[PDB]
């Protein structure tokens, strides 16, 4: 499963 905030967030999964 993919997540990331695109200050970048991450959930990498």
């Known amino acids: 499963e993919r997540f ?3 200050x ?3 959930f990498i999964r």
Do not use: F, L, R
Request: aromatic share 16%; net charge positive; no cysteine.
């Open 4 to 6: 990331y905030e695109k």
């Open 8 to 10: 970048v967030q991450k």
